[PDB]
Amino acid sequence: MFIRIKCFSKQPIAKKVSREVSAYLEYTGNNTWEGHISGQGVSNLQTKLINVGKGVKVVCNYQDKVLFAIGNVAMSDTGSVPKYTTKKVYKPDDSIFTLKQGLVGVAALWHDLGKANSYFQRKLRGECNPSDPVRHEWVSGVIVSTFAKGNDWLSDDFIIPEVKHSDNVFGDDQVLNAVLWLINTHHKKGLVEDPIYRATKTMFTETLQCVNVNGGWFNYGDNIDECYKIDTSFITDTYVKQLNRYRKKLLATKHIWFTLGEDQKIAILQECRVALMLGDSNFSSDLIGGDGSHLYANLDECGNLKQTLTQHLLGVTDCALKALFTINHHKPVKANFIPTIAEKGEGKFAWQNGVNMVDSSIDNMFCINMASTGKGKTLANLKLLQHFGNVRCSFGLGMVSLTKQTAKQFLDMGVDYNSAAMVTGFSKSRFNLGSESLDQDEVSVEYWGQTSSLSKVFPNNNAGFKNKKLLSAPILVTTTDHLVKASGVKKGNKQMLPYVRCMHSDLVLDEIDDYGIEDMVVLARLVYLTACYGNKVIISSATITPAISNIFYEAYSSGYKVFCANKQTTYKGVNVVWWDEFGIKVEKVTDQFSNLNTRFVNKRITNLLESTPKHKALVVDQDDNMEAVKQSITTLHNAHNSGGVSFGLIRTTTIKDCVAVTQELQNWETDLSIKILCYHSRFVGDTKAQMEEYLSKVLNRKGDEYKKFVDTTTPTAYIVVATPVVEVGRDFDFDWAIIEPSSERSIVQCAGRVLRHRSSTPTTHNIHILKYPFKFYRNSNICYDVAGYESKGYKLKSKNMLDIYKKESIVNSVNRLQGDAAFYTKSLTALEHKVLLDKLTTDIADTNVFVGGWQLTANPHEYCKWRRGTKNEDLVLTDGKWSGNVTTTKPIQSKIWRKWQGENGSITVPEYLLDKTICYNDFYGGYEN
């Protein structure tokens, strides 16, 4: 590897980086180094070139592509290294940036006018309840609305009038309404409980007129008259001139505001709100010290009076203005040019040369990567990102362990921690034992990286470790919940960090089908927000349903419409890149996405069907599923075994179902040597982690290394009874599976856990589908709702899987890829597709995906909750002693193959099952006994 590093730094920092860059490369003179170094040499050079201080101006070239660029060095757009750099380059009709500046400046000088009431003064001094009857943002909104109703609010002297209690402060003037919504929602968004309003309201002001004081601001309301008697000590020199210059700025630019569309207004006001909380939290974090008394805004850690309200408003204004400037004029730090990506894929990765069919100069890209598992999907996503140049992306993945797997792939192929940042925000205690030096695994949290210039506008220089890893990451391999808060939050400033993260970075969401329906709705909201700033969305899901692919394209198309009309460019359409392991297709799609997507789906189906059938599923006829499991285990051991040893996966639905199947199979008298494992999610930290590592090392069938992790000498049935934790994110390879039916994507995923690593075709049948789910004996009205898309609004007419599924069927992604809306009441696949198009629709609703008008409100974050689960309290095992109503029990010790013990950790119990003892056990975790 031959690199060349050029440096244009000033001051003695130029000399301090010369020591390190002259420790690793030869000096060619004139502050230019050039030579041969290794991969990790480049890394050590990155780590000790960035850590040496601020102001490092380093460009590295590997062959002729830029390896890395330290700082905001413009470096290369076409040629490299400029000369007479200077200012005043373009100076356009910027319009919408002047609009955002005027809105943020006018609102930020009015965002805390409502702290001047006597209640907030005695709240800061501390002789009343610290919770206000009406929040000060609403009081400042009442001030601004009363001033606007009285005088002309855009060109007049200010003077705060006598204000009363107003239920609504939103009128008709679109720009005033924007300023009012920025003022009122600078801490939290208003929440609308009204069902008719949630049913009908769509527009900007027409929804904003329904935002009343009862949506969170009106806490208790007994001291309203003191909350609206206000002093007017803000009339000073610099506050009045700042208010005048920003109001006239808005006055001069609001003529382009009425030429915007609804989508524009929503996205622009979201940006304005994010910059306003950025400036407000930035000025509230630091201590300024000086004060002019008689009025105060915030309190220090000692509770003393600080940050008087005139200079507080001025500081929040300038900090929000500077926030806006750096978030709207940033050339963000991108990743290194990974040299182990750009070469050609060989063999089964040979489809990854589809990036040589995509244009490298497209400003936008919507990848739908429909490639099957085991083909290197995430490596292909990184290849697609690097085809357009240097990489800046957020790999948002479900589960901690899948982020760990993608991080380990990124580490061992070409990516160091100067470009990658693995973020899992829980600090799990799963450590690697055996040998610390001989590990060559366990990707960790260090991020030598490079701190971006956006950290100076965040509160108190961003944060410590976690938010520095969030914001400053070129490549952010993260759990997805660090990105879905970009679309907005209920309370606080947790929106700004993923918002500013997704503003300048691409978004790569892998296996989006494993998320929930509301989770997929907020993920497509994130896709729309990412496309709002021209970034590229890579979706990587093999079993995509047309509905999902369509609504994600429509979210990207609305976002790219926002980005196109935001830079005053005519919208040519979205560069959609359909991708699988058999080919690629790049089309400029502005309309008719459905026929092209279904034609690519049909081409992928015909490229999947002439291949040999790997998963032949038979739906059993035996009604009782207990003895159906027994007979199917006996049949698939007598048919599918490797010299007497067979691996079976009993995929069931819920935990007590799993322990019921386990306790039946343990007490089942047979000549077969059944060896039973329980693989559900309710387990203690230690025990769970141990199951994972063992299962990953015994079900690895790409080699014969497993022969030494199990007793393959004696003919044995190694059976793993598992819940849907096996069908998501597990690289497992079973000889056969017996599936309790809950949804068709569960069938396809548990087909993907059988012969995942081998290529031998089954002869007779490798999957035995149960006749009924076990909830049929508990609830015959609805049985597929647990881990399925059946529900109270979408009920199957019959629950028989002979009626709702094929008796003999080759299970692949084809049934999920096709998409059928008719006959959803008597087939599982059409039931699935129905729900997917009836929840992820092209409407705005309130919990929908095109959400417009409601982004202003708190409604999409309350009624569409990301990871909406049950109450979930956590019973914690502390050194062998349980906390709550747990009561350790003893398992049946009949056929347990492996049982790992646990002493620490915690189990997640729903509040429903907290009533009784969860009865934790070493073999199977939680049950009802």
């Binding site: 010369s18 020591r19 000096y27 030579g35 041969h36 290794s38 050590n44």
Partner: protein
């Protein structure tokens, strides 16, 4: 303190001539006798060498050794036929991996095991020829080179004494050196005290292969003071076996090509860097001693 760069992937490579080697402002550099200060990339240097009129200091040697750069001094040869004595500072403050030295000792003390290792290392130069084929000079797979390496392999297979190995060593060196001489149409005699460019390019490559061999041996902690091939003529240490594994494959055709094209010594330095870097000859030698040690 990080992984400190592994030795087999270290890339830079110098022999410094007529310059006092010092440290300015953090980095190791060398200052010639005209005021020119050229920096040494000590974190990626494999070895440095010191010719006549050179002088290194203490903290420069420390920054080379603690980073792990083996340093030798080129002069010291005073006999008529032999490269006599090269003085070589080992970085022993870095505590080395141990069991590779134990394996080398368990093969060194057993006489039949040393002979067995002597056998495989004599055909290691034969496979070096086969793997590292240059674009210029001779072709390795011609009838003459294959006939002589076949006679060499047949003779070293039936060998039973180290003096027979020394004799067959002499016929091998005479055979290759003279065949290269024939190809480049010159008369060649290997004298280290000769003004002919085919000779002092060969001594420069002797110093280069010496530095490569001590970096390969020090990367596995192997001392020069365990020569598995020994004799009256062959008394230099283990460096005169792991250095001349790669004469007739790497250095000697490169030395003959450099003495045929006939620019200065610096193109030969840079060509040695280029071929030791492109084919990873250092990592190749380390991996070969790796498959030697555990067998």
């Amino acid at each position: 303190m990080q992984k400190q760069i592994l030795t087999s992937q270290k890339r830079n490579m110098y022999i410094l001539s007529r310059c006092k080697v010092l440290v300015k402002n953090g980095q190791v550099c060398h200052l010639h006798e005209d005021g020119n200060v050229y920096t040494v990339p000590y974190a990626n240097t494999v070895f440095i060498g010191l010719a006549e009129g050179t002088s290194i200091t203490n903290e420069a040697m420390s920054m080379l050794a603690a980073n792990g750069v083996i340093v030798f001094w080129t002069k010291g040869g005073g006999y008529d036929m032999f490269a006599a004595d090269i003085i070589c500072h080992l970085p022993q403050a870095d505590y080395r991996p141990t069991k590779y030295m134990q394996n080398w000792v368990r093969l060194w003390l057993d006489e039949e095991k040393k002979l067995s290792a002597a056998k495989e290392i004599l055909k290691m130069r034969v496979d070096s020829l086969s793997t590292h084929v240059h674009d210029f000079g001779v072709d390795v797979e011609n009838k003459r080179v294959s006939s002589i390496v076949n006679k060499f392999d047949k003779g070293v297979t039936q060998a039973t004494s180290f003096e027979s190995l020394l004799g067959h060593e002499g016929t091998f060196v005479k055979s290759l050196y003279k065949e290269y001489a024939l190809e480049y149409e010159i008369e060649f005699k290997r004298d280290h005290k000769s003004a002919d460019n085919y000779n002092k390019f060969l001594t420069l490559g002797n110093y280069y292969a010496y530095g490569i061999a001590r970096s390969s041996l020090w990367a596995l902690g192997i001392d020069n003071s365990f020569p598995l091939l020994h004799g009256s003529t062959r008394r230099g240490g283990l460096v005169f076996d792991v250095a001349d594994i790669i004469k007739t494959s790497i250095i000697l055709p490169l030395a003959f090509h450099a003495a045929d094209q006939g620019m200065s010594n610096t193109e030969f330095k840079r060509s040695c860097v280029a071929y030791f870097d492109k084919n990873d000859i250092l990592a190749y030698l380390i991996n070969n001693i790796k498959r030697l040690c555990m067998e």
